[PDB]
Amino acid sequence: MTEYKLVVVGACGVGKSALTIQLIQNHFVDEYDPTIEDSYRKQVVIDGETCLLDILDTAGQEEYSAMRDQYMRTGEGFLCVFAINNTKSFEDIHHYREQIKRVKDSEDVPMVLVGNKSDLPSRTVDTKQAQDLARSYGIPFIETSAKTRQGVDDAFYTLVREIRKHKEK
Ligand SMILES: Nc1nc2c(ncn2[C@@H]2O[C@H](COP(=O)(O)OP(=O)(O)O)[C@@H](O)[C@H]2O)c(=O)[nH]1
Ligand SMILES: CC1(C)CCCc2sc(N)c(C#N)c21
Numbered sequence: 001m002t003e004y005k006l007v008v009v010g011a012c013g014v015g016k017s018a019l020t021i022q023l024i025q026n027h028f029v030d031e032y033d034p035t036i037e038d039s040y041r042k043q044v045v046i047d048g049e050t051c052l053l054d055i056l057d058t059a060g061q062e063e064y065s066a067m068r069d070q071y072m073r074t075g076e077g078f079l080c081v082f083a084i085n086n087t088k089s090f091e092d093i094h095h096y097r098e099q100i101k102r103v104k105d106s107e108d109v110p111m112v113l114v115g116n117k118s119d120l121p122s123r124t125v126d127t128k129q130a131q132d133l134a135r136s137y138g139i140p141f142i143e144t145s146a147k148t149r150q151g152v153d154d155a156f157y158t159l160v161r162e163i164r165k166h167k168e169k
């Protein structure tokens with residue numbers, strides 16, 4: 001069966017770890033270590049195909065060494081996460097996209113924009129502005145809540161579909 005290498009990126013505290021644990025283990029984790037970077041495997045069924053997901057949950061200070069660049073190049077798809085109550089994390093999206101485009105040496109990288117913490121009453125990033133941004137990038141936009149599990153499967157599943165469309169080219 002096919003293996004899909006997914007990388008979860010985004011600013012500090014947007015919910016990278018919460019979304020990953022939620023997908024892999026079907027439970028919400030409130031206090032996951034903000035500095036631990038790790039990978040997780042899960043056999044899933046997307047559409048009709050049984051496939052294995054290998055998800056790298058990124059953390060820690062950014063490092064632009066040849067090694068870390070070669071390591072990120074390995075990723076087939078990128079989950080670009082911001083929190084809908086953090087404007088700065090939404091503006092940090094550009095920079096993640098540019099680093100992904102650079103290491104992949106392509107303008108066509110499977111990618112999904114994720115607006116996390118949709119359950120929160122505080123919202124500083126409107127849905128239409130994030131939708132407009134993903135439209136200029138030509139990528140899907142999925143709103144999520146790692147707390148309520150809203151859109152979690154949709155976010156990772158859409159990314160796999162994005163890798164599938166890329167491979168068949
Ligand atoms: N209300 C709410 N809090 C969330 C959500 N996802 C994560 N959090 C909280 O946001 C904080 C940072 O989340 P975390 O997974 O560590 O993010 P990371 O630094 O991006 O890996 C923690 O207090 C989480 O419990 C969500 O969807 N809703
Ligand atoms: C994790 C992230 C910031 C996002 C994905 C593209 C690249 S390439 C590189 N050396 C990185 C680091 N550190 C990254």
Ligand SMILES: [Mg+2]
Nearest residue numbers: 016017034059
């Ligand atoms: Mg984390």
